[PDB]
Write a protein that holds these residues in place. Structure first.
Motif, mmCIF file in Angstrom:
data_model
loop_
_atom_site.group_PDB
_atom_site.id
_atom_site.type_symbol
_atom_site.label_atom_id
_atom_site.label_comp_id
_atom_site.label_asym_id
_atom_site.label_seq_id
_atom_site.Cartn_x
_atom_site.Cartn_y
_atom_site.Cartn_z
ATOM 1 N N UNK A 134 31.303 39.802 45.012
ATOM 2 C CA UNK A 134 30.214 39.052 45.596
ATOM 3 C C UNK A 134 30.542 37.577 45.733
ATOM 4 N N UNK A 135 29.885 36.920 46.688
ATOM 5 C CA UNK A 135 30.154 35.521 46.988
ATOM 6 C C UNK A 135 29.823 34.557 45.838
ATOM 7 N N UNK A 136 28.577 34.549 45.375
ATOM 8 C CA UNK A 136 28.203 33.636 44.295
ATOM 9 C C UNK A 136 28.949 33.935 42.997
ATOM 10 N N UNK A 137 29.165 35.218 42.733
ATOM 11 C CA UNK A 137 29.932 35.642 41.575
ATOM 12 C C UNK A 137 31.366 35.093 41.602
ATOM 13 N N UNK A 138 32.015 35.160 42.764
ATOM 14 C CA UNK A 138 33.382 34.657 42.880
ATOM 15 C C UNK A 138 33.417 33.145 42.653
#
Length: 302
Positions: A285-289
């Motif tokens: 996921x974007x925010x996770x990365x």
């Protein structure tokens, strides 16, 4: 009123401990869907980051940093492992997204509305790119997808540079129930082990041993293992923190023992703690990365 065709090699096994048997599957996903139900937090993550909204989700499992992407009246779809098929059916979603822990729920969900499985395939990095682009097409957010990937590539390269500049050797560990498990670079395309290898495979930490898996036996490692091989940097994932394990003591205090304190990593303030929810529950996921990128960038400061 278009659709988008999604074709992948589906793991037909429903237990996640079972030897996978892959079978190609195609699903016609509606473009600009109006009621999305998501069981895989990493898909929830990316859908939010591209401007979407989640209509239904295993609410009790949505990490606080992703909570904002839920519909104000979002309904509880189940848990990370299990679906409330009567609730979902009643709610008449037009797209259902499943993955990882929820991979096996695919066939049941697909009887209710077109469901896709965005499980990790091969590379963490390949998965990030494919899933984000695809979701981009689904959400009519192609430009935003191109943009976040550009941002993430630059951020990842930034961290790899930081890790390289720290140099040295490193070891990733996962603490669970007072026990230690050695993380190992992913060998093969086996996606069961992509998560453990992330720290080495994406961010480029040099492993303390050229073959950790071997020396480990697959069995937990002792504190004496740390002291023996003595990695310059120790990267810690507190798995009990992420899963809500009761009566578990924090990774920090578990690693506060006469043996580990003699370790180079400990004496030089080279123990870095990674975000348990991001690195272990969501993992994609974007925010996770971005959270991962900030986590790795801590080496710069030590």
């Amino acid at each position: 009123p278009a659709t988008a065709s999604y074709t992948w090699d589906r793991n037909t096994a429903t237990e996640e401990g079972a030897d996978p048997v892959y079978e190609e599957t195609t699903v016609e996903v509606p473009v600009d869907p109006q009621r999305i139900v998501v069981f895989d937090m990493a898909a929830l993550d990316t859908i939010g980051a591209l401007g979407g909204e989640i209509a239904g989700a295993p609410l009790d499992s949505v990490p606080d940093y992703l909570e904002e992407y839920l519909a104000d009246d979002a309904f509880n779809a189940g848990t990370l492992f299990e679906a409330d098929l009567i609730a979902i059916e009643a709610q008449q979603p037009d797209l259902i997204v499943v993955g990882g822990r929820s991979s096996g729920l695919w066939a049941d969900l697909n009887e209710i509305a077109p469901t896709i499985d965005l499980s990790l395939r091969g590379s963490y990095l390949d998965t990030l790119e494919q899933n984000t682009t695809f979701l981009g097409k689904v959400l009519g957010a192609e430009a935003e997808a191109e943009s976040v990937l550009a941002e993430l590539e630059a951020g990842i390269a930034e961290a790899k540079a930081a890790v390289t500049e720290a140099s040295g050797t490193g070891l990733g560990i996962m603490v669970s129930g007072g026990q230690l498990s050695a993380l190992s670079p992913n060998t093969g395309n086996d996606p069961r082990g992509a998560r453990g290898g992330l720290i080495y495979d994406v961010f480029g930490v040099q492993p303390v041993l050229e073959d950790i898996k071997a020396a480990t036996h697959g069995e937990p490692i002792s504190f004496e293992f740390l002291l023996e091989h003595d990695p310059q940097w120790l990267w810690v994932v507190d798995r009990d923190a992420a899963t809500g394990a009761e009566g578990a003591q924090a990774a920090k205090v578990v690693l506060d023992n006469e043996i580990v304190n003699r370790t180079t990593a400990a004496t030089e303030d080279h123990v870095l703690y990674l975000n348990p929810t991001a690195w272990y529950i969501v993992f994609g996921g974007v925010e996770t990365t971005r959270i991962m990128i900030d986590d790795v960038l801590q080496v710069a400061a030590r």
